Design a protein around this ligand. Structure first.
Ligand code: K
Ligand code: K
Ligand code: K
Ligand code: K
Ligand code: K
Ligand code: MG
Ligand code: MG
Ligand code: MG
Ligand code: MG
Ligand code: MG
Ligand code: MG
Ligand code: MG
Ligand code: MG
Ligand code: MG
Ligand code: MG
Ligand code: MG
Ligand code: MG
Ligand code: MG
Ligand code: MG
Ligand code: MG
Ligand code: MG
Ligand code: MG
Ligand code: MG
Ligand code: MG
Ligand code: MG
Ligand code: MG
Ligand code: MG
Ligand code: MG
Ligand code: MG
Ligand code: MG
Ligand code: MG
Ligand code: MG
Ligand code: MG
Ligand code: MG
Ligand code: MG
Ligand code: MG
Ligand code: MG
Ligand code: MG
Ligand code: MG
Ligand code: MG
Ligand code: MG
Ligand code: MG
Ligand code: MG
Ligand code: MG
Ligand code: MG
Ligand code: NA
Ligand code: NA
Ligand code: NA
Ligand code: NA
Ligand code: NA
Ligand code: NA
Ligand code: NA
Ligand code: NA
Ligand code: NA
Ligand code: NA
Ligand code: NA
Ligand code: NA
Lengths: 49, 50, 122
RNA sequence: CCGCAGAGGCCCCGGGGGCGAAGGCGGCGCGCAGGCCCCGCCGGACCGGCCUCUGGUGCAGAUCUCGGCAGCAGUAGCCGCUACUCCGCGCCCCGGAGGACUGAGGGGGAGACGGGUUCCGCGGCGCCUGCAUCUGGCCGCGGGUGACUCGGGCCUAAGCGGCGGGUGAAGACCGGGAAGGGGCGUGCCCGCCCGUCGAACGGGGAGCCGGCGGAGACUCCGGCAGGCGCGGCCCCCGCGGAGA
RNA sequence: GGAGGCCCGCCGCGGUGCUGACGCGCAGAUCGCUCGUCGGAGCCGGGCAUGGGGGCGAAAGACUCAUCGAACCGCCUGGUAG
RNA sequence: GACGCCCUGCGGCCGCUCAAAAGACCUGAACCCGGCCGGCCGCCGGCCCGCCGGCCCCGUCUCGAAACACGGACCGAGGAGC
RNA sequence: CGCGGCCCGAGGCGGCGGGGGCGACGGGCGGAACUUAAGCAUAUCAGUACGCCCCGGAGGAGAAACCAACCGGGAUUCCCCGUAGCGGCGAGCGACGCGGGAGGAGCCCGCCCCGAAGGCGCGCUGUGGGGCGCACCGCCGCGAGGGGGCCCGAGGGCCCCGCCCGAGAGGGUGCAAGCCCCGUACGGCGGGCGGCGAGUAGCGCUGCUUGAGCGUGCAGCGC
RNA sequence: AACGCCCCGCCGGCGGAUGCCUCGGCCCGGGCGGCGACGAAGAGCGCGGCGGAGCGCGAGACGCGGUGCGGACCCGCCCGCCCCGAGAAGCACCGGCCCUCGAACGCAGCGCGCCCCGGCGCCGCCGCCUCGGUGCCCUGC
């Protein structure tokens, strides 16, 4: 139950085995799509201005 | 054993429901070459560790 | 096959609620028919349509409710977090554009007496 | 100098190719040699002579690496646990008859842990059942675990964690001296200071009989009881004995 | 009358001798006879504690998951070699 | 993967589709092996072809290897001065 | 024995923030040994591996308590160029200036004057204002030009004669296809005065670090 | 002798080299540089007409709705669509749904509380409400 995850640089194979991108990555995919081709930037510009 | 928690019981339940072959109409719908499911297990040979 | 949201948006909340009740009841009936006896083509055909019909009605109800609630908090200072503008965490926690352009008064005075001009050489 | 893979050029109407390329097998010829060429059969879509350029460029060995495979050889072996036979029907399945064994610290009847569907019915022999198989814990298709009273959920043991804080570059580790909660019911009264962590064997409020299925039973059904709560109606603030 | 780190002896717990069997094993330590002990410094199950130059030891450099005169896993590391 | 014919069933023959069986599959080498057909022991040389003459097992370290010095059952592919 | 102000504390409520993830690049700490020296202990490997903490689209650095010694330059960063020195003075290690380029940009607070003029439930234990005298990306589209004969299971093959070209990049099609199909070339739309920082700088002793050598930088304690 | 063994001329096995081919790798350049208490990355368990693995999705589950474009199919068996719009396959953007664990938030990990109306985690900043002090004072008594 440590708050942080157990990661060590002396084994890049275990990092390879479990890490970001080895699952679905639903929210990140949606946000990246809305940014590269979408209206997230226009919304941000309107909100800031 | 006969005295288990519900949490262990639910994980073993999924293993049993998944130990199935590829249906016959699926093999021909997808034009499959390899017709066996190599994620099956047998109780006398496996170690589920669950 | 099935209902259309088009003519669904033209009913009141009570009517939609009753419609949903009937759809769920007959979905239970179709589940019973599948579980017992045998799956004749007509009831199995009706099954998928009924499932998507329940989906459509729930969609309409929620959209109507959201529109009403959003109209309830149109001009308040603090609104529910589900109605605030869609941004990322990082751009939410950021200075606006005019806050970035603020200058102390002395620098403002200096930058007005020497404005940028257009010129050419030769 | 011979050969291998690739790059830049040439190959006199624009190099050779389904009228058959690469590769494989057999046979001539040429060269001191490394090698090259041609012919026949197989094969079924690519190939390269000369000039300049480039390199992960030539194997008999390394108790070399990976793959395949021989002799040995129908050889070594199929020695614990006393044992099977006749007929239906087959040394091994089922039935009847006979003959034996385990020998109540059981080759019996049941649980804990571990396993996880191996359980039951129907069908089957492609795999496995180191001989066979009509058998099966094997393969296919369908099914199967019911609780007020049994166990867990509660308690605490040895222990573990948390604790205003303390320390260390941190990660973290150590820890009584700290304005540390309730009740009734709205005002008052009481009160120094953790844990619904840790035992399917310890503590713990209360269950027996009969019967039913193919696979479940202290759980289902029938009967007869216990314990603990809640709601109505009636409904009481103690007498006897010389004493125990 | 019924004491005892008393004696014979079953299950248990051990492991003497045959230097027996086996030794391409039933088995990367087993099998058979024979043997030691058997009310105690006895034996068994579960929970918990001690962690690597450390632990634990009626002391053999023993044991610490087939690994111990310093465990195992990955990395420094394609470590250096007259 | 037609039809037909045998078969207690398992299977077999004959043929069919196709340019071709290319038949669970492109091509299909070596080692090792079965049938039929021809021969009798390896290499070099001469010859009218089984006679005569010659010939220790390679690679390696070493003054010195056929060595009772080490490595090597056999075949394929990979394999070490950039 | 009661209650008002200030000060120092306690419990609750409302609104806003924080925490975790990311084999690169970036910043800050802790910090090896194998190895080389033909042994090895200072040295080297290396201010590396690895452990811990923290951001961003970059980060960090930055407008002189600087270089220099010239007929001088002029914040920071990045590229080109090259020997002073350190060292069992062994093995080894090692900067900067001048010169040529890319890029180019400057400023504030405190102290001093006014004093609530302020962001007004805060704040005089100081809010607010001032120097005073002389002088390239995305979206949308159209897109030309070949027949005859022979022979093959099918020709993109062989022979003859043609066409298109701002298109002879390619891919597909029953065998080598500009002209069988898709594409390729050629478009449009959107975006004088006052005043300069104290347990500080520096020094003594000790530890680490550097090419820095009677000290390159840092730190502890005493002054 | 013959067999066995060992050597030529045809035919069969066993094995899988070679050649040709590859929607895959590796290097170089360019762009981008965007997660989270509004619940991330990750894990578990479910969801299809006939449904095992993988992808996807979340009790609205092998997807729902809106706006544009597109224009006949939908891998098997079925069901559906067919039309000057009546709408299959596909594509882009937008709006919602979003089970249990997880920084993981009533306690705990699969059980159990408090509360009165519904809700009940920690740390910080600002503000407010209710209070304490033989702190510095003051008044009254
Ligand atoms: K218990
Ligand atoms: K050790
Ligand atoms: K020797
Ligand atoms: K020897
Ligand atoms: K160093
Ligand atoms: Mg072909
Ligand atoms: Mg090469
Ligand atoms: Mg070889
Ligand atoms: Mg024998
Ligand atoms: Mg007997
Ligand atoms: Mg039993
Ligand atoms: Mg059975
Ligand atoms: Mg089975
Ligand atoms: Mg009980
Ligand atoms: Mg109970
Ligand atoms: Mg407990
Ligand atoms: Mg008990
Ligand atoms: Mg009862
Ligand atoms: Mg039973
Ligand atoms: Mg006694
Ligand atoms: Mg005794
Ligand atoms: Mg012996
Ligand atoms: Mg023997
Ligand atoms: Mg110690
Ligand atoms: Mg001869
Ligand atoms: Mg001779
Ligand atoms: Mg040698
Ligand atoms: Mg030697
Ligand atoms: Mg010698
Ligand atoms: Mg020799
Ligand atoms: Mg080779
Ligand atoms: Mg708060
Ligand atoms: Mg090294
Ligand atoms: Mg040395
Ligand atoms: Mg050496
Ligand atoms: Mg040494
Ligand atoms: Mg150095
Ligand atoms: Mg910066
Ligand atoms: Mg065209
Ligand atoms: Mg073409
Ligand atoms: Mg200054
Ligand atoms: Mg140094
Ligand atoms: Mg699946
Ligand atoms: Mg939770
Ligand atoms: Mg929790
Ligand atoms: Na050839
Ligand atoms: Na090579
Ligand atoms: Na009998
Ligand atoms: Na005795
Ligand atoms: Na000794
Ligand atoms: Na190594
Ligand atoms: Na081919
Ligand atoms: Na000799
Ligand atoms: Na030797
Ligand atoms: Na040997
Ligand atoms: Na953090
Ligand atoms: Na970011």
């Amino acid at each position: 139950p440590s708050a942080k995850m157990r990661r060590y640089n002396w084994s890049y194979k275990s990092l390879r085995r479990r890490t970001q991108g080895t699952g679905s990555m639903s929210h990140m995919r949606k946000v990246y799509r809305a940014y590269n081709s979408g209206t997230l930037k226009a919304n941000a510009r309107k909100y800031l201005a | 054993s006969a005295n288990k928690t519900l949490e262990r019981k639910l994980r073993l339940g999924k293993k049993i429901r998944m130990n199935k072959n590829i249906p016959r109409w699926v093999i021909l719908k997808d034009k499959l070459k390899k017709r066996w499911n190599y994620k099956r297990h047998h109780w006398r040979r496996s170690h589920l560790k669950l | 096959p099935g209902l259309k949201a088009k003519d669904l948006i033209g009913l009141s909340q009570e009517d939609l609620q009753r419609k949903l009740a009937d759809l769920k009841r007959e979905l239970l009936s179709l589940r019973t028919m599948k579980a017992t006896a045998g799956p004749v083509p007509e009831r199995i055909a009706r099954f998928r349509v009924c499932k998507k019909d329940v989906a459509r009605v729930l969609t309409i109800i929620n959209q109507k409710a959201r529109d009403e609630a959003r109209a309830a908090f149109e001009g308040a200072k603090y609104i529910p977090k589900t109605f605030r503008p869609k941004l990322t965490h990082a751009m939410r926690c950021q200075l606006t554009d005019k806050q970035k352009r603020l200058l102390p008064n002395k620098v403002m005075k200096r930058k007005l007496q020497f404005p940028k001009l257009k010129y050419a050489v030769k």
